[model samples]
Target: MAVPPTYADLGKSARDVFTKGYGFGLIKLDLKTKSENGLEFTSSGSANTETTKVTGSLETKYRWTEYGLTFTEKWNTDNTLGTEITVEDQLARGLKLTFDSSFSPNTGKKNAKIKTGYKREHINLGCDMDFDIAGPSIRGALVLGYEGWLAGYQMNFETAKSRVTQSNFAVGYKTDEFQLHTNVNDGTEFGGSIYQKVNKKLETAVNLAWTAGNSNTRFGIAAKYQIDPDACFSAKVNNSSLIGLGYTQTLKPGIKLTLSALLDGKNVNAGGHKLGLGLEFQALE
Candidate 1:
């Protein structure tokens, strides 16, 4: 995928990122602030050396009414820095436009890109561009629907490879309590996921997939429960007999702690479960 990360996307909740860890041996902390200055990352026995390229980043954004600015920079342990700076404006009705440039000081390479979208009553459209090495790709998406019935169409054109890397179509109907989405890409693989809100504090999701000519199916289920206002617990048991548990707690007004463990249910005593712990702090200013 030749997609570029936006500052807004980068600034999303840290919980969104750590939620992907597969049970154990992983601990991550995300510290962000209203002023857009913060730190967040993970560490194991040795963290800084084992990972580099995509593991660390810096993001900040400021917006007021009609215009705003976004900035993001990412670096690897190897000391390579990728930067994105975007200017946003909603200068037109039902539409927004953004212009950004991505650069790497290590290689002295830079590319300018633009993104825009418009949404009226029942339809929405958007596009994005990527011009980095192995890129020069364009992606576009269009959706039409009313209420919960939506039909989504997407396309990607990659000039670097001179091919249509992805052409996807999806349709789904979503209600307040349950939602389902199915997608097909280039007519090769088919997959779908359903999400159910079991109640106010509990939610569950299941995924299904079957690739062309492969008899073995892929599927998974995950659940999350909010135990209270300041803590939550979650677990996942996937098709591979892998089980993981996680807990999060708030220690203070601007502080949080997270712990997790991963295990192989198929062999409980293999080597015991892997464990992880993390802490996060936010700055008021």
Candidate 2:
């Protein structure tokens, strides 16, 4: 028996393949740098159709390895300030604790949360508590695994309403070449995903979701191919007849470029296609 992924990580592999890098109709940029003293800085921005649709954020982080702690602060152009502190392994092995807070200076709104996680040989557990003007809420999750099989459940409780706001259960199995997962949300929305490593340089994934009362099942299939050591290509298609293609290239040691496109498969000539471009640059001390 080994420690499996937590509940939150159950379907992440297939989800990432199907939805991760395609940012249609937007241009995004990110820049990151780190100093010798363990200080990190990141700035990122995105632009959409209108100038008013632009967003930007600046973040700084520092890690203290001696105490297993990290501190991060972020500022957004939308007048929001956020801060987070994380502590790992100091209290116990495989234990992590995080405190997060955010404030909207313009609106005078504030939010705070505390989260903790612990993992052992066969079980993983996590809990989060949130505080805001709307009141306090709590969510907890537990996952257990034996061999290659895993099962987990998560629930959220709303204190103001004295009710369960959300609940989900998941089961998964993993092998050397493929992984399968299924989950049900609130006993209504059901979803399943699979990730398969076809070979050393090729991978494929599929995601399917359906609601109890809905007549249609939404699905997406994605594939990734590593062209060479520095370049990769990926493509995905969904039930709605949208096709996405992406290319990623590592130009230099610290620079990378990504381009993506989304096309209307059913109406290829109807003139409703979108393109996205992203560039990331990093510098290390």
Candidate 3:
């Protein structure tokens, strides 16, 4: 029915091209498989200077006459467990209700939240409430789409204070060749981004942001080139004196590898540089 993107994903496609896979001094590995009983399992391990964190997750789903149920459970090395349960098409054809919770046995910390969302051909709406021990806070988002343009707004309201804590607005236009997005946060921070697909093998993007009362500016430009069907290279630079380069290759049908590096722009001759490596393996059957 041509539903638009959610509020959080208004400009995600353009931002991900430059921000994703650009890590420094990090290593990550992911494994995914599906069991014979239709249960999906995924595990990931990430390491940096501090420590190596491992996470494992299980997911399953069931369908009923009128609604569907989905469940997910995850455990991490930090002794925390997370769970999510969702009911799709509950009472309404385009509505989803979900419950999310997390608990830490070692620290005795717990959190839970309820989220609801409804999507239509031209409108999207979502709301969530956190059931905290101290107080409960609510957040909501709305997005409207027409033709190739989209507008979105979101804010958080604190019940104790009876005021809004956060507010943001975003607008975007997308076409076959290019996309443009702009956003304003609390009427203070302004940002814009553009993504262009030059050809079949080349793509580029630029992002700029500034504060309302500050003189400083943040800018970034990135480009990616597809070397072949299974390999690609990307480069990016920002105004903060940092340059990043990345290479992604498909080692096999179910295995992929990514190499990323960050270099100092001001001190090019210096030996200070950061590198990242990532690998992923999946078996659907």
Candidate 4:
């Protein structure tokens, strides 16, 4: 099995991707405790509509000489029950097999999902398929990376057409200075992004996209100054008549502040502006 890269493997792991909540406001906290007695605890909290909503999960594991299994119990502010289980078994000739399944018993509905996949050197693959009284459906993915190059695709099969209704392919390349990713869907829509490290204190992030029979195009770019370990600044503009300016400041370990502004670029709104201030921290673990 190929070990996954840690977030630390990439510079900074997006310390300032946003100035709002996980999806909402100014502050968010997610924490996980160290494993003890074959169990661990974790929780997530965020500001939402004049209140803070929190959810938590309890993780437990069991193991022996050849195989291991784990399960997680989860609950939220709303009264709901959910659990997830995963199993990994050692197999012959250095191959590993895994299984995953999750279910939620909420609001009189028993919703569930099941996934199984394996690991190997040349390729890593997985599939999701379910059939009911109506019929059947399938969704799956294949990934391959070698020598700083990547190739992958995801598929959704259309049973009625006896064909694939939607398909997407992505190809990427990485070098010391930059990485480029481009993806397309059956030639109807396509987009790409470039992240380049120009020098020590500067870099670039830009996106270009096309759709509507490939006749129109849209673009946006953001430039960031590494500046220092304590502060950084960036500005972005997109095809829509919107522009953004942002600044990030590291307050202390596990804490940071971010300020943001959105402006009307077309001037049709009479120089309208919206601003935001946000703070994020790690706690409770």
Assess every candidate by TM-score. Answer: 0.67, 0.81, 0.81, 0.69
Question: After superposition, which runs of candidate 4 have C-alpha atoms over 4 Å from their true positions?
Answer: 1-26, 49-66, 76-80, 91-108, 130-136, 158-163, 227-236, 241-249, 253-285
Which candidate would rank higher by lDDT, 3 or 4? 3
Candidate closer to the true structure by lDDT (higher is better), 2 or 4: 2
Over the stretch 218-272, how does candidate 4's per-residue lDDT look in tens digits? 8888778877879988878887757777888896675777777677674634644
lDDT of each: 0.62, 0.79, 0.75, 0.61
TM-score of 1: 0.67
Candidate 1, run of 10 with poorest lDDT: 5-14
Those runs of model 1 whose alpha carbons end farther than 4 Å from true positions after fitting are 1-24, 33-57, 60-65, 68-78, 99-113, 132-135, 143-146, 159-162, 197-201, 264-269, 272-278
lDDT per residue as tens, model 2, 1-285 = 125444456632242323233334788999987856777788999887533467788998888684588888889656789798997875457888899888888966888989898888878888789977578888887777766787888878887789998788889887776888888888699999888878878889998989999698998998889758699899888887678889889876767899888788756557667888899876654
2 versus 4: better TM-score goes to? 2
Q: Among all windows of ten consecutive residues in candidate 3, which has the lowest summed lDDT?
A: 11-20
Of the pair 1 and 2, which is ahead by lDDT?
A: 2
lDDT of 3 at 276: 81
Residue-level lDDT for 83 in candidate 2: 91
